[PDB]
Amino acid sequence: MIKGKQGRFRQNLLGKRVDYSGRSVITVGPYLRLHQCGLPKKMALELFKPFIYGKLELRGLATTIKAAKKMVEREEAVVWDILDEVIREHPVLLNRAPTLHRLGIQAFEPVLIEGKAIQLHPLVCAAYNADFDGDQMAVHVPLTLEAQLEARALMMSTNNILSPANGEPIIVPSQDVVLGLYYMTRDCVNAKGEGMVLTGPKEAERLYR
Amino acid sequence: RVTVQDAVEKIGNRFDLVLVAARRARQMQVGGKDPLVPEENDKTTVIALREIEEGLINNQILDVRERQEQQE
Amino acid sequence: EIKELLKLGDLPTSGQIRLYDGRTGEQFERPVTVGYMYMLKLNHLVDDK
Amino acid sequence: KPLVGTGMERAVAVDSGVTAVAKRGGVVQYVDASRIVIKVNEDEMYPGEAGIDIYNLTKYTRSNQNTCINQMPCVSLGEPVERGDVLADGPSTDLGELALGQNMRVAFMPWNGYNFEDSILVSERVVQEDRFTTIHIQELACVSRDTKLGPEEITADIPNVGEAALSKLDESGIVYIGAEVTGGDILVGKVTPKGETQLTPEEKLLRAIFGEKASDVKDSSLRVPNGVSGTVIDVQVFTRDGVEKDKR
Amino acid sequence: TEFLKPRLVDIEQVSSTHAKVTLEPLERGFGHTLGNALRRILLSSMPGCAVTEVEIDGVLHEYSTKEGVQEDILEILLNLKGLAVRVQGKDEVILTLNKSGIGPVTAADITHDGDVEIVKPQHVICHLTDENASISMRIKVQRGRGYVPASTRIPIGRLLVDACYSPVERIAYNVEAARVEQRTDLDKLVIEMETNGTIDPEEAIRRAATILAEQLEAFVDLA
Amino acid sequence: SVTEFLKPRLVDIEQVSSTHAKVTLEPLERGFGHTLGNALRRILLSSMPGCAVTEVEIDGVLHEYSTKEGVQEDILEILLNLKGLAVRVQGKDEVILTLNKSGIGPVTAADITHDGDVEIVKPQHVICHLTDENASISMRIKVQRGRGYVPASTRRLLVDACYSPVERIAYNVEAARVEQRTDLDKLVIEMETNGTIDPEEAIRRAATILAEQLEAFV
Numbered sequence A: 001m002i003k004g005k006q007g008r009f010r011q012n013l014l015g016k017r018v019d020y021s022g023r024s025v026i027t028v029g030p031y032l033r034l035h036q037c038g039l040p041k042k043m044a045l046e047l048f049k050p051f052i053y054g055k056l057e058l059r060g061l062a063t064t065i066k067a068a069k070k071m072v073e074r075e076e077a078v079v080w081d082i083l084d085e086v087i088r089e090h091p092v093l094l095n096r097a098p099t100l101h102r103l104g105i106q107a108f109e110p111v112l113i114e115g116k117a118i119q120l121h122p123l124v125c126a127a128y129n130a131d132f133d134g135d136q137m138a139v140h141v142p143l144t145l146e147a148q149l150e151a152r153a154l155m156m157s158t159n160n161i162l163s164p165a166n167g168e169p170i171i172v173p174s175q176d177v178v179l180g181l182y183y184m185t186r187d188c189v190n191a192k193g194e195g196m197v198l199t200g201p202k203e204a205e206r207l208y209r
Numbered sequence B: 001r002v003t004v005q006d007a008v009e010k011i012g013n014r015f016d017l018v019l020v021a022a023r024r025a026r027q028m029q030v031g032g033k034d035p036l037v038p039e040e041n042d043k044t045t046v047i048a049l050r051e052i053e054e055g056l057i058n059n060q061i062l063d064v065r066e067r068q069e070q071q072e
Numbered sequence C: 001e002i003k004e005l006l007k008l009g010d011l012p013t014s015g016q017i018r019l020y021d022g023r024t025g026e027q028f029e030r031p032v033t034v035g036y037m038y039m040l041k042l043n044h045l046v047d048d049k
Numbered sequence D: 001k002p003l004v005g006t007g008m009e010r011a012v013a014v015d016s017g018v019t020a021v022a023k024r025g026g027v028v029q030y031v032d033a034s035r036i037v038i039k040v041n042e043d044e045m046y047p048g049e050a051g052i053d054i055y056n057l058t059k060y061t062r063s064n065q066n067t068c069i070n071q072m073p074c075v076s077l078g079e080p081v082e083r084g085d086v087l088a089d090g091p092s093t094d095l096g097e098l099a100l101g102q103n104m105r106v107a108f109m110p111w112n113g114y115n116f117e118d119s120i121l122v123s124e125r126v127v128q129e130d131r132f133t134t135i136h137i138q139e140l141a142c143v144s145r146d147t148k149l150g151p152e153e154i155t156a157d158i159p160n161v162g163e164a165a166l167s168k169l170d171e172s173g174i175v176y177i178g179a180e181v182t183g184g185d186i187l188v189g190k191v192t193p194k195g196e197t198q199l200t201p202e203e204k205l206l207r208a209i210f211g212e213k214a215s216d217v218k219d220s221s222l223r224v225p226n227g228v229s230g231t232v233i234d235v236q237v238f239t240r241d242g243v244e245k246d247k248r
Numbered sequence E: 001t002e003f004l005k006p007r008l009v010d011i012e013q014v015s016s017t018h019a020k021v022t023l024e025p026l027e028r029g030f031g032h033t034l035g036n037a038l039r040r041i042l043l044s045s046m047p048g049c050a051v052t053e054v055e056i057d058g059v060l061h062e063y064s065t066k067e068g069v070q071e072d073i074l075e076i077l078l079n080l081k082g083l084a085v086r087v088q089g090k091d092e093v094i095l096t097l098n099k100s101g102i103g104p105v106t107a108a109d110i111t112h113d114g115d116v117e118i119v120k121p122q123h124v125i126c127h128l129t130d131e132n133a134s135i136s137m138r139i140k141v142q143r144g145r146g147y148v149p150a151s152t153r154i155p156i157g158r159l160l161v162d163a164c165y166s167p168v169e170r171i172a173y174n175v176e177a178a179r180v181e182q183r184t185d186l187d188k189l190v191i192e193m194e195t196n197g198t199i200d201p202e203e204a205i206r207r208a209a210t211i212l213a214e215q216l217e218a219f220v221d222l223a
Numbered sequence F: 001s002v003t004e005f006l007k008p009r010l011v012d013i014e015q016v017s018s019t020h021a022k023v024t025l026e027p028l029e030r031g032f033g034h035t036l037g038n039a040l041r042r043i044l045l046s047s048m049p050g051c052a053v054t055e056v057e058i059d060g061v062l063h064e065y066s067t068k069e070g071v072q073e074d075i076l077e078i079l080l081n082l083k084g085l086a087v088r089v090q091g092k093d094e095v096i097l098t099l100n101k102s103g104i105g106p107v108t109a110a111d112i113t114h115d116g117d118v119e120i121v122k123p124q125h126v127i128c129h130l131t132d133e134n135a136s137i138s139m140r141i142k143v144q145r146g147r148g149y150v151p152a153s154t155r156r157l158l159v160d161a162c163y164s165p166v167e168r169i170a171y172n173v174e175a176a177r178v179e180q181r182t183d184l185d186k187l188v189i190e191m192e193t194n195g196t197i198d199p200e201e202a203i204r205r206a207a208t209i210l211a212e213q214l215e216a217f218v
Ligand SMILES: [Mg+2]
Pocket: A130, A131, A132, A133, A134, A135
């Protein structure tokens, strides 16, 4: 009993199939802020299920718990509203497969999309190292209020601009954003609008548009 | 709330900040005692962090109030 | 040979065409490639993942 | 048909095996969605009783990775056919030529982010006209063993299930062909005889007298796995020798 | 300072399916604005009459196959989904088709009805090869917008087929110079629509104008 | 049924300060956000009736690249400052004013002559600055009425004419929610004007122009 793999010393180290888990293929997420993770509907109604039960029975939409279960499984329109309320601020933890870095368990806020693909802000695709060619990330949630405060304070994706090893940022524009910036500022010897004095930046954008 | 940098210096440690905010949030979730700042659909925990940043909530204040009501 | 084959159709020799941006209705400067890349659909389907 | 091949797609498709290649030339007497009959050319006829090929194409059946193996006929009625040609396209074949994916008019340009690392936009048209759409065919197998305390029963009678579940089943306990099942619906109505010897020796007394339960059976029906739709094609039944075949 | 209002000067039917309309007069800048707005609004927000449900007599479920018809059932549904019909008045309507005998099963032999009209009878639906083989089917049709697949909108012979409610398939707008008219800078906006014949150019352009006018009138008054 | 489309309910009119507004509309159907946003942007930026300074001349200068003694700034600097002047004029199509003055200190818009109908919306707007008492500034400024942006090259020094009162317009579309369908595009237009008119009335004018344009069809 104190030896081997079933030895109860080395038991909480082998690996535990944690609840409130998830998975999905990944998809780029422009239009997200830098602290938002687009989470699917079909997976966010099976992660925050008990939270939905709580906020549903408490609101009285279905007091008895079994009614709440049968309501969520009925896809009734009210459950979408309640789920939006519960995930209003309830950080989720997105974890890539090999978690070498300590950034590999960063945590985001959720915003609900349709379909089924855990969207992910582009800039934070570096620390994870994902490449959007089939990479799959797991979604855990913190239950206890202390764990919620941890996921919002110690791990939120907006409090880890600087990676542990090297001081300089690891939220660094990567592939298309830099090409866009490069194009947006380059000296062309002669082109339309050459030789003039417009105003501050506002009239410059007006001129370009 | 999005970042928590403002709360770091208020409770210098960044972990005692976590536990103090959790104390206040637990007080404000089922222990009644509504937040002293208005909410914007925010969860109780974010309101706790917000008030911590406002400076009107700290571990000393929570202990003082707990002792005061424990004398009752 | 590709240049000649394209030239048999009326399409430009470059292989690039000007593309308009659908959402606004302006022109993309820097003309862009457009062709027929025979794409697959590998069976890593999301709803099995 | 790929728009840019290499001249090897033809041979790969012909010799792969799933293309229903002819055997003797002649004329296509009678095409069909499930059979092609080829009148043999006179010269190639045997010494007796020629004029028959009856190429039994393969209508929809499951593959080893859930992809329909569907063979369609690619010959117009009456068209002559030469030996070793392609009478019926297989899965991913087009007049013989191998066709794995599909064309798609692409434009290499970085749009607003959505192709950031390697992502790929796709206009609704590609899904609207439905040119990428597979026909995965699953195979759920339900079995009826005989454990301790009597055999397993496949009867439609199941306790603790609403009339909705039994609405689409048949009397035997097996769903009808072409039943648009969904998540949670019972495919096969299976049950087990309520656990084992429990409680106390009074329970052994009951077993001696036999219990007093009309149900006397636990629910173990095999349902659709959660998250998959589907239209049942076929439901095969297999029987151990010495078991009388039931209604289904 | 005045803004010359536009008008639909001409609607020439170059072909049965696709056609071109001309807008005139337009002033500088307004050309591309209206052209893009009309292309964008036309390509999505239109009414159609695409088939929605099919019920073939001797077909149990979609993935089966009938007899005497080389086309599999799925190909039949594909072609029906490609079928184009012009339906007025009645919201939804049922059509019948019971062609028998060898040969094509083109839409022409679909059972006649009232205001329903098959725009393109030549479009093949399926084929018959066996003399004593008949394909009898009821085809439902409703009217809608955009795209509504089978699953979202969801007997056993009720074969659901994905909607494709849309009359237009390619909208292109060009802006060019008009006559002198004692005033230069007047833009002629030529809009060509490639439609499946169910909708005429004038009706489509006017409906697009109406929908955009309503959406923008929702902007006229603000708090 | 087909004619039905989700009409917006005007919600956000957030007017930051007095000229920078951030309007939002929702819920619109799939893609209407972009088409409305682009239409409004193009019509506002390109065609908006208004009046702006077009030509300016200095009494003692005829060359663009020169200077006036006692002036801390240079001619082009004054040209830019005048370009930033916001002025609304009565129904008179165009009119000429003068900036005759002499002294020491900044020279603002308020120093401009009223000239009856013409009223500068921002008198405190800064134009020039003199340092010597003997230095006297005298110059003529002509303002016309127009419906767009007129670069100088497209044309007695020339000032690019920004007739359109709207100074900036940026629209975004962000996915809103209605029950289940969650691809509806909440539009968000932030626009800022020179000050001759608030953003609300600017949006009203743009919408009315577009609606009148479409009127002939229906
Ligand atoms: Mg990878």
